[PDB]
Design a protein around this ligand. Sequence first.
Ligand SMILES: Cc1ccc(-c2nnc([C@@H]3O[C@H](CO)[C@@H](O)[C@H](O)[C@H]3O)[nH]2)cc1
Ligand SMILES: Cc1ccc(-c2nnc([C@@H]3O[C@H](CO)[C@@H](O)[C@H](O)[C@H]3O)[nH]2)cc1
Ligand SMILES: *Cc1c(COP(=O)(O)O)cnc(C)c1O
Ligand SMILES: *Cc1c(COP(=O)(O)O)cnc(C)c1O
Lengths: 810, 810
Amino acid sequence: QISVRGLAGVENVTELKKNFNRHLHFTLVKDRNVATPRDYYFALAHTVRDHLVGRWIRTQQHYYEKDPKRIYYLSLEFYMGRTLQNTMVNLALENACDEATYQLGLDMEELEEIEEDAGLGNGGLGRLAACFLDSMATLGLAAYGYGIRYEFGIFNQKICGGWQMEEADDWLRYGNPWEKARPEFTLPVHFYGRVEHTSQGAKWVDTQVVLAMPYDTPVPGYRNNVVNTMRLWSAKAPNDFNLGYIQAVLDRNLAENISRVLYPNDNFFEGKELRLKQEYFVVAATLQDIIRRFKSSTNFDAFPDKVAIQLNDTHPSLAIPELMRVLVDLERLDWDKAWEVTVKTCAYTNHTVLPEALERWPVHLLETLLPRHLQIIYEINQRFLNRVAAAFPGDVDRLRRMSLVEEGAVKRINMAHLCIAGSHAVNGVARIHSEILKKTIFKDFYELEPHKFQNKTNGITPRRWLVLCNPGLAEIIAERIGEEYISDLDQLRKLLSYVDDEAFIRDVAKVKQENKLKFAAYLEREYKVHINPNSLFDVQVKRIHEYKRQLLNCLHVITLYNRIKKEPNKFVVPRTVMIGGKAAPGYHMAKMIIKLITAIGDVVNHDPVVGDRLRVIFLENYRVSLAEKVIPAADLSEQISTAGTEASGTGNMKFMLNGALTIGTMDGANVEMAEEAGEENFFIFGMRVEDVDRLDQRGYNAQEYYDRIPELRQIIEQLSSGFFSPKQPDLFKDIVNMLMHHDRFKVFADYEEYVKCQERVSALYKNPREWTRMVIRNIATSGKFSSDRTIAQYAREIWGVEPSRQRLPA
Amino acid sequence: QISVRGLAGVENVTELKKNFNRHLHFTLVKDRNVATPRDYYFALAHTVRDHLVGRWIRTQQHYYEKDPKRIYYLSLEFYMGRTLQNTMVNLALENACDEATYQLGLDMEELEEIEEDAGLGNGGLGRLAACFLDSMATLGLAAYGYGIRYEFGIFNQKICGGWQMEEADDWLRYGNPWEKARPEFTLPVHFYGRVEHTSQGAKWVDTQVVLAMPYDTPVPGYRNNVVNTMRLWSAKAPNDFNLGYIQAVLDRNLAENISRVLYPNDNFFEGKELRLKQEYFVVAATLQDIIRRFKSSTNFDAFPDKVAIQLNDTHPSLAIPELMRVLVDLERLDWDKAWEVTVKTCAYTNHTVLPEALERWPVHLLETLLPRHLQIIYEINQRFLNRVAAAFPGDVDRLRRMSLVEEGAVKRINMAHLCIAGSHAVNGVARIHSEILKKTIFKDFYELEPHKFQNKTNGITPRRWLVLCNPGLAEIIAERIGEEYISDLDQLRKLLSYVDDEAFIRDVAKVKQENKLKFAAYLEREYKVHINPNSLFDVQVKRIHEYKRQLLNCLHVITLYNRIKKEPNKFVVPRTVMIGGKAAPGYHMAKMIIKLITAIGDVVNHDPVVGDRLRVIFLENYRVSLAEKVIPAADLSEQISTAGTEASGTGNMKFMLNGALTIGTMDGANVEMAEEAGEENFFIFGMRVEDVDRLDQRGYNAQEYYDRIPELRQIIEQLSSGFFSPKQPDLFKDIVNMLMHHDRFKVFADYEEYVKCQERVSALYKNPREWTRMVIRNIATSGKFSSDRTIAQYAREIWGVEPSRQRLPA
Ligand SMILES: Cc1ccc(-c2nnc([C@@H]3O[C@H](CO)[C@@H](O)[C@H](O)[C@H]3O)[nH]2)cc1
Ligand SMILES: Cc1ccc(-c2nnc([C@@H]3O[C@H](CO)[C@@H](O)[C@H](O)[C@H]3O)[nH]2)cc1
Ligand SMILES: *Cc1c(COP(=O)(O)O)cnc(C)c1O
Ligand SMILES: *Cc1c(COP(=O)(O)O)cnc(C)c1O
C-alpha cells in the first residue's frame, strides 16, 4: 500500500501465511471454523514474534563476545503500550503482514485493536522509559531496561454519572505473547532481619527471603537487527515459606503482593511500606544480575568501565547503598574504593521539583525493613557532610540543608540528596528545568560539585509517534525527502523548502482532515458521541493535576459558552474541546476536576442555541493506545502548566510532530520547542518563571482578578450558584474555594492572557492556508525532540559510549 | 530397541529431530551452547505435544457432529503424575523419540526425570480418576474429566531428624506444557447472597461472584487416535472486585484462594468453609458447561439421554441440588420433572465406610454460603422421607436414620444420603465393599430401592502400570503372546501355558532382578543409601493411616530383628523392608508412625550383628513417579488393612501386574485377587470381616494378646522403655497407649497369624523356581483388574453407552 511500510514480496507473504496457519493450529489449538478475532490476533502475534527470535539470540551472543560497556536503565515504570505494530514497523514487516492477512480474509487493523496496552506506568515518566528503550536499540547500545512486572498496571478508567471509577487492569488475562519467563534465573531478595558485627565486617542475618523471577521482553531497534532486553521481575515465595498447613500456603500472597500492582500516583509521593518493598525488590534483583554478568566476562576497578546504571528519578535510589553493601560486606572492598566505584557507575535523572513528589522516607521504615542500608546511608551522610564542612567552613546552615537526614517530627531520608551524593552526573529533563535545579532546589550541591550537573532535554521516538500512529503524514514526508528521517529526525528541516509548495500544503491539510474523520468515526462507534469534523480540535490529554491546569482550560470553555449565549447570531470558529486523563484514586481535587469537565459538557452539549459551534468531550481511559489515535487528529495542543512546574512534558512533542499548533506557557520543553520553530509560529502566553516569583514575593491574591475581570466573576458566580449542577448547587464549592483562597498554581493570573491568545488561534484557523503553513514550520523543526538525539547525548556525555547506526547481520 | 515401544522409521526420526530443534530455538529461545537438560526436556515435550493437536481437534469435532451421549466424571482430585512418557506410549512414538534424542546426543530417560508430577490428588481416589480417564479414551467414550486446577498439589515430603516436614508443591513454577488455558470460556460462580421469593419462583440475589477459568489438558487413548479432555477450573476475581484502591486490588486473593491448594487429607473429612467453596466452585462451573453443550446440539426430557454425571464420592454432591436449581429456578421446569431428569442423569460412587471420612456439612455453613441450595436440600429431604413413610408406615426410627438432615448439637447434612436419594445408581468399588454398603451403612436405602445398588470393582491402567513402568516385563510377555493384551488384559491368561517353560521362568526372574538393580542404584544416587539387591524386597507403599496398619508391619520388623539378636548365627532369608507414604499434616498419630519407622531403621541398619540380613528404609516423598520405580522392583506387596476398612485398594493391583506376591488380609479387592489367582498362590492371613464383628461384639481387649504372646510383650516393653529412642525414652508413649487401650484397628489381633504367614513367604523365597512359578500364576490372572474392564462395566450398566475399540482416522 504505502512506501514506508516496507515490501510485500511473494515469498515473504507466502511464508507468513503458512506460519499464521501453523500457529492457529498448533499453538492456539483452534480450527478456522470456531476461531474468533482474538484467536486471529494471537496467531499473527506469534507469527511476528518468531521473526524476533534469531535476532534476539544473536544480539545477546554478540554482547557476550564483544563485551561492550553495558547500560542498565532502572525504572519502576515502563509504559510500553501495544507491541504488535511496533514490532512490524521495526522489522519492516508491516506491508507483508497486511498482504498476508488480507489474503486470509482478515483486516489487520481490526486484529491490532485486540491487543491490550502494557500499562506499567502512570504517564510521562513511564513513557519516557519506553521511548528510551526504543532509541537505545536503534542506536546499537548494549542496554537493558529493568523493572517490575506488575500483575495490574494503571487502572482502567470508567466514567459513571460524570465521575471517575477505577477498574483493575487485568492485562495478563489472555496471556502476553511478547514476554518469556526465565524461572531458571530466579534470585533471592532479603527483607527485615538485623545487623550483626563480627571480626570481619557486618552481616545481615535473620532475613525474610522473597524470590525475584525474571520475564524478558524483546526490544527491537529500527531496521538494524538489534534486539535488546527489558527484564521485569515478578515476586515469588520460597517453597518452605511459612513452612496450620493450609494457612501457610495461603499466606504466600504476603510475599507475592510486592509485584501485584502499580502505584497509580503521578508526580506524588505516597510513603507506604509496600512501595518501599517494590523499590528494594527491583534494585536488589537487578544488581545481582549486573554483577553476575560482570564476573562472567574480582577486579572491581574496571566495574565502571563495563557498567553504567541510570536511575530514573529517585525510585531506584536504593541502588546506591545496595551496591555499597555488596562491595563492602560481600566482596570485602574497603569503603573508599567501593564508593569510588559506586559514584562512577551511577547517574541520576530528576523529573520534578514539586515538593509533594519528592521521596523522603521515614527512618523508622528503613530501620525495620532495611537495617543494613540505613547504616550505610548514615555513613554516606557523615562522609559527605565532612566534605561540605571542609569546603564551606563554619556554614552550619548549609550542613543542615544538605544533609541526607532531615530532622523534625519524624526523621526522614531525602532520597534526592542521596542520589546526588552517590552519582557522577545529575541531570534535568529540559533546559529551563535543569537551570531551576541549579538555582533553587539543588543550589547547595551545584556549588559544591558544579561538574555533576547536566541537562538532557527529553524526546519521543519517531517510530511509535509518527510512523506507527500517522502513516499518512509519514508517507507524504517520505515522498519529498526519502525515508532516512525516521532514524535521523533532523532531516525534517528539509521540509522548510516546501512551505510555499501548493501541493505539499494541500497534502498536509488532507492528511489532518483524514485523521480527524477517522477519529470522529472512532468516537461514534466505541462511545456513541457525535462530533463535527470541520471544527477546530482543541485537545488537552495528560494526567489530571492542579499544576497542569485543566481548570484554566475549563474557564476558557465556559467563557466561549457565555460569549455565545450573549451574542448567539455572531459567527465564531467552531471548536471541539477534548480533555482526557486519569486522576490518582486518592486525589480528591483531581476527581472533582473530571466531574466539572463532564458537568460543563452536560450543559454545553445540549444547549440548542450553541448548535455544533462548541462541543466539550471528556475522553475516557486515556492511555498510550488512545494517544496514538487522538494526537494525529488534533489541531491545537494545550500545554498550559504554570511556568516552573512541568519539568519537560513529552505530549507536547508528540503533538508538534503530528501537525498540531501549540498554545502554551514558557514551561519545560515548550521553551525549546518555541526556540526551534520560532516564537511567531507558537501561541505563547502567560507568566514566565520570573513573573511567578515576583507574584509569590508580593503575595498572590486571587480576589484582585475576580474584582477586575467581569467575565471571570460571571464564571465563578455560575460555579458557586449551581448553574453547572442544578440538583446539587454546592457541588463545586471545593473548587471555587481553592481558586479564590489557596491556589498554588495561579489559574486566575494567566486567565486574561490565555483568553486573548485563544482568540489569535481562532483568527488563524479561519485562514486554512496560513494555518497549514505554520504547521509545516512546526513539523519541520521538530527534529531536536527525537529520543534518538536525547539518548546520543546520554551516551556521549554520561555513559561514555558511542552510538552506532550500523546493522547487525540478519 | 524393544518391540512394544513402536517403530523408529527414518522419516519419523528425521521429522522429530527438526521439530525438536525448532522448539528449542523458537519456543524456548535458547541455542545449544547454553541449553540445560531442563530446556531439552521442554523441547521434547513441545515436540510430542504437537502430535496430539490434530487428533484433539478432530476428536472434539467428531463428538460435535455425531452428538453421542457425553460422560462427565466430576472429581476434586486427579492424580495424573508425569505426562511425557504416557503420551509417547499412547501415540506409539517412544522408540522414534528415543532414536531422535539419541542422535542429538541426549539420553531420553534423563529428560523424562525432569518433568514434575501433576500431583492433584492424595492417593488412591485421585489416581483412580486418572486411570479412568485413560481407559475412557482407550474405549472411545465421549468423556470429560472436570476438576480444579490447584496451584499447589499434594505437598512434597522431606524427612528431617526422622520426622515428616511439608513443603509446598510449586508444580507450575517452570510452566505446564500440557495444559491450554481457555480464558474465552470463563464462567461466573455465585456465593453468599440471599433468596427472594417472587410471583414466579425463587431468585438468588446479592451474591459475590468468582470467575471460573478453564484449562484443558489432552487425554490420549491407546493407539486409537482419540484425545479426550480434562477441564480444570481456576478461580479469578472479577475486575470490579472490591471496586482504598491498592488494598482492593490486593484483596483479589480472597476470591482466588479457592483454587490455591489441595486439601491433603486421605480418607478424612475436614469441614472447613474453603473446602465447601472448592466443592461448589467445581460443580457450578461444570454444570453450566454441561448445559451449554447440551443446548448447542429447550426439551430437557432428552437430557439424561445425552448426559451422564458420575460423582466421585460425595465431594461433588452439590451437583444434585445445583442441577435442580438450574432446572427449577432458571429453566422453569416443574419440580417433579426436574427431579426425574436429575435422578436419571446422576450416579454416585462411594469409596469409604470409615465414619470420620464421611461428609456431613454443618447447616449453618450452607445457610450462609449457599442459601438456595439449603432450601432445595430441605425440599428433597421432605419428599424423600414422604416416600419412606409410605413404604414403611409407622417406622419412625427409619425416618430418623434415613433423613438427609442429622439432628444433634449442630444440625448437619449427610451428603451420602443426598447422593443416594438423587442418583439412579450407587456403587461400591469392590465386591466385599459393595456388600458391606448393603448390609450396614446404607442398609435402609437398599431396602427402599434395591435396584440402585451395584458393584464396580476398581482397576488400574495397564498402559501406565505395565508398559510404561516395566517395559522389560511387557516385552517378554509380548514375545510369547503378542501385543493385543495391552488393550485387552484378559489375554494374560495365555501365560498359564508357560508356567512350566524353563525359558519363561528364567526371563521373568531376570526382569525382576534387573528392576531391583536399577532401583537399588536409584536409591544410592538420589539418597546415598546402600541396599542388598539379593534380599527379598518387602514393600508397603500407600498413605500413612491407622487402618492401613503400617504399625503391624513395624511389629513384624522388630520381631525379625529380635529373633536375629537372639540367634545371630542362624540363617534367615535377607530382607529389605521398604515403607513409604505421606501423612496428612494434621494427623498426629500418622506422623508418629513415620517417626517410629525411621527410629527402627536407625537401630536396625546400624547393628553390626544384623549385617545386611535386614534393612529398613523409609521411602521419602512417595508419589506416582516413585510408584513407577518401586513397584516393578518389589518381591512382596503388603496389603494388610483390617478386614472391612480398605474399600478396594489399587496399589495391590499394581503390584500383582508387576510380579510381586501379595501378603494380605481378606479386605477390599484382595478378596477378588485371591479368587482370580487361586488362594494357594496368595499369602492370606488374619481376621475376616465376620471375625472382626465377633471381636467387637465381645469387646476387643489388647491386654489379652500382650499377656499370651511373649514376643509381642518384648516389643511393647522395648517401645515403652526407650530402646528405639534413647535420648527421649517416652517418645512413643502415645503409640503404646493407643495399641494397648484404644486401637480401633486391632493390630495385636492379627499379629500371630501375620508373623506365621511371613515365615511361609520366606520359605518360598528360598526356592527361586517355585517363587517365580507362583509369580507367573499371579501375573497371568491379573486381567480382571484392568480399568478397561471397570470402565466397560460403568458404560454398560450405569451410563448406557457402548465402548468401542475402533480407531479414528489419523
Ligand atoms: C510516583 C511518581 C510517578 C511519576 C513521577 C514523575 N515525576 N516527573 C514526572 C514527569 O516526568 C516526565 C519525563 O521526564 C516529564 O516530561 C514531566 O514534565 C514530569 O512531570 N513524573 C513522580 C513520582
Ligand atoms: C478428602 C478425601 C480424600 C479421599 C477419600 C477417599 N475415600 N476412599 C478413598 C480410597 O479410594 C480408592 C479408590 O476407590 C480405594 O481403592 C481405597 O480403598 C479408598 O481408601 N479415598 C476420602 C476423602
Ligand atoms: C506522552 C504521554 C504522557 C505525557 O503527557 P504530558 O502531556 O507530557 O504529561 C502521558 N500519558 C500518556 C498515555 C502518553 O502517551
Ligand atoms: C496406587 C497409588 C495409591 C493407592 O495405593 P493403595 O495401596 O491402594 O492405598 C496411592 N498413592 C499413589 C502415588 C499411587 O500410585
